Structures are given as C-alpha cells and as structure tokens.
Design a protein around this ligand. Structure first.
Ligand SMILES: O=C1CC[C@H](N2C(=O)c3ccccc3C2=O)C(=O)N1
Ligand SMILES: [Zn+2]
Length: 108
C-alpha cells in the first residue's frame, strides 16, 4: 500500500505521472528555473506522463534544457498549466518537465 506512487493534477485529480518515472536530467530530477516574466518554477523531470494536452508547435525560445524545444503541457481534464513537453533533443529525445507544486502525490 505505497502512498507516494502516483502524481495527479492538484486542481482536479487527473492521473499525470508516477514517482517511478522521475528522470535525473543532468544528474537531478529537480530543476529550478525562471521564465522571462520572472516566475520561478520548481520542475520535476519525468520520462513519461499522461493525461496532459500538449499545446501548439514546439519552440526553442528561452528553453531551459539545451537542445530541446518545448510545448506547453496543460492538464487535459481541467486546463491547469502543469508544465512542458520537451522534444527534438538527444538521450533522451523527449521528456516532460512538470511543476512539482501543481501535482498531488498519493497511492495508485
Ligand atoms: O523551457 C522553457 C519553457 C517555456 C518557458 N516560458 C514561459 O514560462 C513563458 C511565459 C511567457 C512568455 C514566454 C515564456 C517561456 O518561454 C521558458 O522560459 N522556458
Ligand atoms: Zn487538472
């Protein structure tokens, strides 16, 4: 009965990811970043996620992760901005960067 195994959308409960899918990009699954508007995000990298809607076409503008282009990732149920999908890079080609405090962790 593990209580710390799946991540859901904090706003609505949509299933998003799993602790097992955390990905240590450059040696750490956690990355702290800012956007051009100065908003700070504590980003958890995941190899895999579900339940999202990836919006529009990829962009390399202001990418936090060298060699990757991003798309906004919304909660596919409620529209909450949960993070970004990264693509176009190498080892891995793709991953998800999700905002830790916009997820809730709990049992499967
Ligand atoms: O890797 C990324 C993901 C997108 C992120 N980003 C934002 O969070 C944002 C908000 C408003 C205008 C432009 C941006 C932007 O590039 C950013 O700064 N880097
Ligand atoms: Zn949601």
């Amino acid at each position: 009965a593990p209580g710390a195994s799946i991540f859901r959308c904090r706003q609505c409960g949509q299933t998003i990811s799993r602790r097992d899918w955390l990905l240590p990009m450059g040696g750490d699954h956690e990355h702290v970043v800012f956007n051009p508007a100065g908003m700070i995000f504590r980003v958890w990298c995941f190899s895999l996620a579900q339940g999202l809607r990836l919006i529009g076409a990829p962009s390399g503008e202001f990418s936090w992760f060298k060699g990757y282009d991003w798309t906004i990732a919304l909660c596919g149920q409620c529209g909450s901005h949960l993070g970004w999908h990264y693509e176009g890079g190498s080892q891995p080609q793709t991953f998800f960067g999700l905002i830790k405090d916009r997820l809730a962790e709990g049992p499967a």
